[PDB]
Amino acid sequence: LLGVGNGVLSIETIPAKLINHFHEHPIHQYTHICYEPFNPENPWTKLLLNALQDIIPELDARLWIMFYLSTAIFRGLKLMLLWLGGGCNGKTFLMRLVAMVLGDHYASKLNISLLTSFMRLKGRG
Amino acid sequence: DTIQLTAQRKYLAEVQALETLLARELSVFLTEPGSKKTNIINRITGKTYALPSTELLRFYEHLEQCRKQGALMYFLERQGTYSGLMLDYDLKLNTNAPSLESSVLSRLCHRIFVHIKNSSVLPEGSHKIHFFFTLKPEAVQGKYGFHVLIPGLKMAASTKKSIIASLQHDATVQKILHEQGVANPESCLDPHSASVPSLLYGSSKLNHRPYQLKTGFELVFDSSDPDYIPIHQIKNIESYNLVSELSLTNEQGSLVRPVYCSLSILMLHDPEARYLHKILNLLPPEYYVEYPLWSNVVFALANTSANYRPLAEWFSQKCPEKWNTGGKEKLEKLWNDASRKITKRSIMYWAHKHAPQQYKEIVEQGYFSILAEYVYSYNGTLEHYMIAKVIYAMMGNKFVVDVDSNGKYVWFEFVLPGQPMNQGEIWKWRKEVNPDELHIYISENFSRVMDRITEHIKYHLSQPHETNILNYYKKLLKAFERSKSKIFNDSFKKGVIRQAEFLFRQRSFIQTLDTNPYLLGVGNGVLSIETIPAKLINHFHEHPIHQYTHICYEPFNPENPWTKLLLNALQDIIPELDARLWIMFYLSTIFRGLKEALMLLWLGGGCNGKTFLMRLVAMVLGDHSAFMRLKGRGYGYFEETNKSEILNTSRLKEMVNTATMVAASNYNFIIDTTDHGTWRRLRHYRSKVKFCHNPDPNNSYEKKEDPRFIHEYIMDPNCQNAFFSILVYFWEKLQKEYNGQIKKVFCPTIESETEAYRKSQDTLHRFITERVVESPSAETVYNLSEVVTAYAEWYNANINVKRHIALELSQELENSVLEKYLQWSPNKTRILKGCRILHKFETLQPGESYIICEPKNKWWEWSPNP
Secondary structure, three states, X not given: OEEEOOEEEEOOOOOOEEEOOOOOOOOOOOOOOOOOOOOOOOHHHHHXXXXXXXXXXXXXXXXXXXXXXXXXXXXXXXXXXXXXXXXXXXXXXXXXXHHHHHHHHHOOOOOHHHHHOOHHHOOOO | OOHHHHHHHHHOHHHHHHHHHHHHOOHHHEEOOOOOOOOEEEOOOOOEEOOOHXXXXXXXXXXXXXXXXOOOEOEEEOOOOOEEEEEEEEEEEOOOOOOOOHHHHHHHHHHHXXXXXXXXXXXXXXXXXXXXXXXXXXXXXXXXXXXXXXXXXXXXXXXXXXXXHHHHOOHHHHHHHHOOOEOOOOXXXXXXXXXXXXXXXXXXXXXXXXXXXXXXXXXXXXXXXXXXXXXXXXXXXXXXXXXXXXOOOOOOOOOOOOEEOOHHHHHHOOHHHHHHHHHHOOOOOHHHHOHHHHHHHHHHHHHHOOOOHHHHHHHHOOOXXXXXXXHHHHHHHHHHHHHOOOOHHHHHHHHHHHOHHHHHHHHHHHHHHHHHHHHHHOOOOOOHHHHHHHHHHHOOOOEEEEEOOOOOEEEEEXXXXXXXXXXXOOOOEEEEOOOHHHHHHHHHOHHHHHHHHHHHHHHHHHOOOOHHHHHHHHXXXXXXXXXXXXXXXXXXXXXXXXXXXXXXXXXXXXXXXXXXXXXEEEOOEEEEOOOOOOEEEOOOOOOOOOOOOOOOOOOOOOOOHHHHHHHHHHHHHOOOHHHHHHHHXXXXXXXXXXXXXXXXXXXXXOOOOHHHHHHHHHHHOOOOOOHHHHOOOOEOOEOOOOOOOOOOOHHHHXXXXXXXXXXXXXXXXXXXXXXXXXXXXXXXXXXXXXXXXXXXXXXXXXXXXXXXXXXXXXXXXXXHHHHHHHHHHHHHHHHHHHOOOHHHOOOHHHHHHHHHHHHHHOHXXXXXXXXXXXXXXXXXXXXXXXXXXXXXXXXXXXXXXXXXXXXXXXXXXXXXXXXXXXXXXXXXXXXXXXXXXXXOOOOOOOOOEEOOOOOOOOOOOOOOOO
């Protein structure tokens, strides 16, 4: 269960059901990113599908990465990725977009100084 | 006029019994308005009822119980086609009251019965017909009236219209009234009497006294053989249920016998909406004819409450000219826009601005009313929450409470001119440890309302009532006197404040405080940079602004001597037009929002103004573990540099990923970074002017020094005022020219200086500029290892003998300016495409290449060149 701007998002069953009424689920954490049903005809939807395919044209790699990043919405038992890039390659845009879409409650910034030389990952997805 | 009905419904049992009856078991008979089934109208509540006779009897007897004690009611009954007969006689008086003697009334009854016996349906046989004469308590402004009620007769509406038409031109009644001081006895009978619904006996109109039954006559008519009508008087009329007897539609009368011949809704059931309707009338007419004002008013109404639509038409209906011509869809579009910033505080502000005395009277009456129902509803015992409610209604526009990070309630106040205050805090929100203003206010201003309710109680005590009402009011006065002094008690005052901490609570206030970067707090008010030209706000507004600066703000005045000398000093510091404009445009971005990272390294020889301006820029705009010092600031630079001008660490790049940061130094830097991303957001400038006691006339780099600049003008407020005006002027110029984008500013001198300084500081930048030349005709393809070897040779033969490593060179080049030049080869390798690399000491081939605003006296004005 995830707290979003317009309610509580449940990933128990496919398709996901939005809880926008009275319920007895004990949900307290939330993020400002509202959820809407997937519209492939939405201009912003297709604009992002275009941007994602431009960043990673290679379909196996794109599908694997976007499936891997689709696990960010799941905050239970879970692989570490080392994705390289010279710069202005679209990785910073997508990683910042993931951070903002998941929120500070669910997503956290990690500093490379810690690994080179812990509690901020508490219950994060 | 609501206090007495509240109190009459507070100390008149019969009234409370009637209220319980009507609210509980007469409520099932509610009828939608306009239904033909409705027989009773309640003006006050506005609710319509359809009572069957079985409950109508109890209704009428409850009213009669209520009426005998003098309680005021405003009821009505709807008489339809077939009901009793009602005559209205608004007698006009030459001198302000006719006697209406009993013998005269007998004459009038005999003449109206002649016209009823004439020209009519009447049942055959012997029958009883009753007449009643209710008279006005007193003639007002020489205007008297009395009524004739005939509940016994039952005829159609047209038959009543025929009867009243025949009475209108009757000379007998008119000449009877000629000596009665009746100016026009002809025009006294209202024809609409047979159609307009009649008020029940004992009821009356707003601020009108009910009619009093002077006497009631009874007549016996025998259609079998009329010989003489025996007009006599009804005995013991007082021992009867007069409301039940005199009802036109009643059929169960003991003596009277049947002889068979929306914006309004919203204001009603919403007292505070009714308050808003009362106060909106104070607006001058321009507010609904001028779009800007009407749109703002409806935008505030919609934002505060979405159910105020009918009121929105009503205010729009104040001008039928624009309301009928396009008003409907304009209002709908405005409502849709608002539903998809301004509240009633602005509306009260405007009302106080335009109609002060009416505003004061309206608000005082509202406060009196509110604390009055609190007084009556609890028999004169006042507790903390009631006082809190009255205070919140009274000062809902000056104090705000919100929970800070410590979980403690925090008080905020909007500062108004004329009260003690720290300088530069006007028209802004200040944090208060304790709400001292409320603590004084409850003792001082509130006691006025308490005295108002005290003087009202004494008034009702003086007026003639029965004994029980007097005993009630004596007890109420005693209780209110006991409860009156508590508002000065410290514990009571503290409890009231704690209780009001919940009403005044406005959620999300602290997180919205000073959030908008397009507003600045200044000494004389709040500065706005939303649009050009800049505007200074020194009036009431809903902007949540707490932080401020001590600089007063004035519009750009070129003729100002301080502005003139400031412009000349600025020209002296940076003689070049392009450099001066670049520095001033950059220094003018006070902006507390999203700012770029054009990290500027301002060099100079000292006593050039760079150090002077470095401290000077801090004074004009100050506040807007070292990393956290940039949170919320809009600018800020460092100074006082030693020879040890190296970058702070490997973390020296981490401080520039919402304030403009500029590096000022006595010498060129030791920073020496090795990436093109790093160097692209870095700028360099070195001062050329020298300020000295004896400037060289032949040297433009030497000018007369002004030691008075550094110790008196900087402490002179007007200097900072002019500096702030100059800064906001240059800011407006930048956004009106380049849409606010600083990369669009042309800086050939500064760009050249930065290029040269980078050539000095980075060995990779030097190699690119010296040995890498773009060449489309160069068919040679240069690979990663080849570039590494060429750079190694260049470093060895020009810089120093050193053993290089290809691993770092590959990354350094892939993250260099050659990122687009090092295109991917078919083997994924990094190769040089469309460009050439020089070998040992060659030169560029033909066609290859290495990889104006002139000073004016009015330089601060517009520049023709983009």
